[PDB]
Amino acid sequence: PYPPLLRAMIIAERQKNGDTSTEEPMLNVQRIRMEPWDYPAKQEDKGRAKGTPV
């Protein structure tokens, strides 16, 4: 579902435009693929430590 306020604002626009419907607005979260935080990142884009030796 949409959070409380956003839902109320989407339903009000429907009624204002004239569309009469009782369907619930809902967020399509199927596109969002939540990967684990320990999924291997791209090493090619990672930097490297600089030369200053101790």
């Binding site: 959070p3 409380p4 306020l5 956003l6 109320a8 604002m9």
Partner: protein, 119 residues
């Protein structure tokens, strides 16, 4: 001032005087000073209860959506304000902090009861 990288963020800029805080919700560059240059003002937040016992929050919801749609990040206090308004889901840490407080107060009622009961 052209910064190296960075990004836009919607955050709280502290105003007011000593002991009288007042926040302006602004979309500003990540690296800019808290109270310095900003791209757009998107609301305000009075954290002090007024005569009516209210904490007033203004949110330019039309422009907040525009800037989130342009890649603006969000500060944690700003995400929590949008949760309380109902614009976003409740931030997990408000749920967890609410649960931590419940457990703390439940533990406080044991010692209080024991004292009155035992003594």
């Amino acid at each position: 001032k052209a910064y190296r990288g960075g990004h836009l963020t919607i955050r709280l800029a502290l105003g007011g005087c000593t002991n009288r805080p007042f926040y302006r919700i602004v979309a500003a560059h990540n690296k800019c000073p808290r109270d310095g240059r900003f791209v757009e003002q998107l609301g305000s937040y009075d954290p002090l209860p007024n005569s009516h016992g209210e904490k007033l929050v203004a949110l330019n919801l039309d422009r907040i959506r525009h800037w989130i749609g342009c890649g603006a990040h969000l500060s944690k206090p700003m995400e929590k304000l949008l949760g309380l308004a109902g614009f976003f889901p409740l931030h997990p840490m408000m749920i967890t902090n609410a649960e931590r407080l419940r457990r703390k107060r439940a533990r406080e009622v044991l010692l209080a009861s024991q004292k009155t009961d035992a003594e």
